[PDB]
Design a protein around this ligand. Structure first.
Ligand SMILES: O=C(O)[C@@H]1CCCCCN1C(=O)c1ncnc2[nH]ccc12
Length: 164
């Protein structure tokens, strides 16, 4: 099970950890990917999760897009977790660096409510350009299921806990 997490609320927990290493250790039922609408896992959390699957996540993702088309910003799909988890919930938060509406961040976090427990990053943070403090606030105020957040950056983890 999950270990070394700080409890933020009844259902939200947080740890300074690499989500790839956390997924390999825990093998959770669901790992969340910070996806884009095309499921092109080039960089950030998505690039790191995909590289850990030896590109099997990208091959499966390309078949899903060829069949279904792109996701919506704020939407999600469930695919295999490969060697990292039973399932990967690919969730698209708004990318501020591309001009997307930040109000869609709450819709993106609502996808987590379909799963009892998840290992996840903060959506729309990092290379997606949103303020991670805002993303954690929206997470706590939207998700009702058990979420284990992994924050890679130590300095950002410390700021997120101290300002919570
Ligand atoms: O979790 C983090 O600290 C980072 C960076 C800023 C905060 C937002 C989340 N985030 C990422 O999206 C990320 N980006 C690229 N590679 C990564 N490896 C693990 C996480 C990760």
């Amino acid at each position: 099970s999950f270990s070394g997490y700080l409890k933020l609320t009844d259902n939200v927990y947080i740890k300074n950890a690499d989500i790839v290493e956390e997924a390999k250790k825990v093998k959770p039922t669901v790992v969340v990917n910070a996806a884009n609408v095309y499921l092109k896992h080039g960089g950030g959390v998505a690039g790191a999760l995909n590289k850990a699957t030896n590109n099997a996540m990208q091959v499966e993702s390309d078949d899903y897009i060829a069949t279904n088309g792109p996701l919506k910003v704020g939407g999600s799909c469930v695919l295999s977790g490969h060697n990292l988890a039973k399932h990967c919930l690919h969730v698209v938060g708004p990318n501020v660096n591309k001009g997307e509406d930040i109000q869609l961040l709450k819709s993106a976090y609502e996808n987590f409510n379909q799963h009892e427990v998840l290992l996840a990053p903060l959506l729309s943070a990092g290379i997606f350009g949103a303020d991670p403090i805002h993303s954690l606030r929206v997470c706590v105020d939207t998700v009702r299921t058990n979420v284990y957040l992994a924050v890679f950056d130590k300095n950002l983890y410390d700021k997120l806990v101290s300002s919570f």
